[PDB]
Design a protein around this ligand. Structure first.
Ligand SMILES: Nc1ncnc2c1ncn2[C@@H]1O[C@H](COP(=O)(O)O)[C@@H](O)[C@H]1OP(=O)(O)O
Ligand SMILES: [Cl-]
Ligand SMILES: [Cl-]
Ligand SMILES: [K+]
Ligand SMILES: [K+]
Ligand SMILES: [K+]
Ligand SMILES: [K+]
Ligand SMILES: [K+]
Ligand SMILES: [K+]
Length: 177
């Protein structure tokens, strides 16, 4: 199914490409032809046309293809430089987290998990669902994106709803939901 093959694609492209004999470049891209060969180790019926279709139909914009290169647009656990197009229009973004993190966030802002980027969403519901990954007692921070930009932080369009930024200072957090 597209779900099973996309879940593997995301694991290879975000977390363990070397296990599959792939070497990402500095921007996270691998050969899409080599990716097909890697995925066929698990799902031998997959084709390049199928992987391209998964990319086109993905509801979050998880993937990006340029020529023969494919990458995950976000969520890597290894170093990548992601020169995505800047989100210049959003005025408010959201960050889902768990209540036990409020004390540190209100002291030093939102920090990336050594991940280079903090993840935000244009939608409250998506941020809530992301926060659920770290526990049950989820809260959603309202982020003043214009304030963020004014401080010099570039906010990048990483997915259809996901936005990435280096750091969110405390004074850019306008509310808790
Ligand atoms: N259809 C999918 N294709 C690729 N990755 C997926 C898919 N659904 C969930 N994932 C990923 O599995 C992890 C667990 O997700 P969840 O908590 O929603 O179950 C997330 O990294 C999530 O990435 P993503 O944030 O892009 O959905
Ligand atoms: Cl909590
Ligand atoms: Cl999110
Ligand atoms: K490659
Ligand atoms: K094909
Ligand atoms: K998908
Ligand atoms: K990648
Ligand atoms: K979030
Ligand atoms: K920006």
């Amino acid at each position: 199914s597209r779900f099973k093959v996309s879940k593997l694609m995301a694991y290879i492209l975000r977390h363990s490409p070397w296990e599959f004999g792939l070497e990402p470049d500095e921007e996270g891209f691998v050969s899409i032809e080599e990716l097909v060969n890697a995925v066929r180790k698990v799902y031998p019926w997959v084709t390049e046309e199928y992987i391209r279709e998964i990319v086109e139909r993905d509801e979050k914009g998880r993937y990006e293809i340029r020529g023969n290169k494919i990458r995950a647009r976000y969520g890597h656990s290894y170093p990548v430089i992601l020169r995505h197009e800047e989100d210049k229009e959003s005025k408010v973004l959201y960050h889902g987290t768990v209540r036990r993190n409020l004390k540190g966030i209100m002291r030093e802002g939102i920090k990336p998990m050594k991940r280079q980027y903090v993840h935000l969403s244009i939608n409250y519901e998506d941020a809530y669902n992301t926060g659920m990954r770290h526990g049950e007692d989820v809260v959603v921070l309202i982020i003043d994106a214009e304030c963020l930009r004014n401080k010099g932080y570039k906010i990048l369009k990483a997915g259809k709803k996901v936005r990435i930024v280096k750091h969110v200072p405390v004074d850019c957090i306008s509310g808790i939901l």
